[PDB]
Amino acid sequence: MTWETWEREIENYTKQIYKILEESQEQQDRNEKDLL
Amino acid sequence: MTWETWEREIENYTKQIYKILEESQEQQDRNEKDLL
Amino acid sequence: MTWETWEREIENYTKQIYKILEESQEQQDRNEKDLL
Amino acid sequence: QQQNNLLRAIEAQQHLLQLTVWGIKQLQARILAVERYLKDQ
Amino acid sequence: QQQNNLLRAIEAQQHLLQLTVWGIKQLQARILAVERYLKDQ
Amino acid sequence: QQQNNLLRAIEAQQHLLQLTVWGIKQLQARILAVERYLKDQ
Known part of the structure; x- marks a missing residue:
């Protein structure tokens, strides 16, 4: 592990x-619209 | 950003x-009491 | 608090x-198998 | 809804994590500057 | 209940986060002390 | 399922936390090395 890889x-x-x-x-939100 | 702000x-x-x-x-806990 | 304790x-x-x-x-997984 | 709540709690901790990352990067740069200062001597 | 579980997992990670914050603060103070030591020279 | 999702989000943040811990440990060792270098002078 290195700092460049760490950041990525x-x-x-x-x-x-x-x-x-x-x-x-x-x-x-999809399910809420489903059960309305 | 500064360390004072960071802490806050x-x-x-x-x-x-x-x-x-x-x-x-x-x-x-409210709902559990509701459905008992 | 110390670094040894911190690590632990x-x-x-x-x-x-x-x-x-x-x-x-x-x-x-247990419940999914329950309701199948 | 409780799912939405947990989701927001995670979101908030994500912001915390971003702050700790900023701090770590700041410290890394500062330590590196000190290391270089001493090596340059 | 599973919601309660996720909630506890988040709570545990919160404690971890607090520990990393402690560590970062310790390091910041120590780096600052070194910076000051060198500037004072 | 949404519970499983939140669970994975927490898992991902756990990996992030592990990375910040690695970074903090690296910095602690490097600061300590500098402190020792200066004390040894």
Whole structure:
């Protein structure tokens, strides 16, 4: 492990987390519209 | 960003998280009592 | 607090988290099999 | 809804994590500057 | 209940985060002490 | 399922946390090396 890789991995997990948050939220809005 | 602000923002998010945890838990105990 | 203790506490919370993740997942697979 | 709540708690911790990353990077640069200062002597 | 579990997992990570914050603060103070030592020379 | 998702988000943040721990440890060792270098003078 090195600092260049460290920065990149941090960015990779971060950008993933955000995309995952929006995913769960996406389905939740989808399901809310389903059950109205 | 500076270290004084950094400390304050850390504290602000921390104290928020705890208050949020207790919130979700509050509703959960409320709902458990609802469905008994 | 010292760095030796710091390392040990970090390890203790980490190894806990993983065991907790697998727990929640364990029950979820159990419940999925229940409702089939 | 409780799912949404947990989701926000995670979001908040994500912001905390970003702050700790900033701090670590600042310190790395400062330590590196000191190391270089001493090597340059 | 699973919600309660996720909630505890988040709580545990919160404790971890607090520890990393402690560490970062310790290092910041120590780097600052070194910087000052060298400037004072 | 959404529970599984939150669970994975937490898992991902756990990996992030592990990386910040690595970084903090690296910095602690490097600061300590500098402190020792100066004390040894």
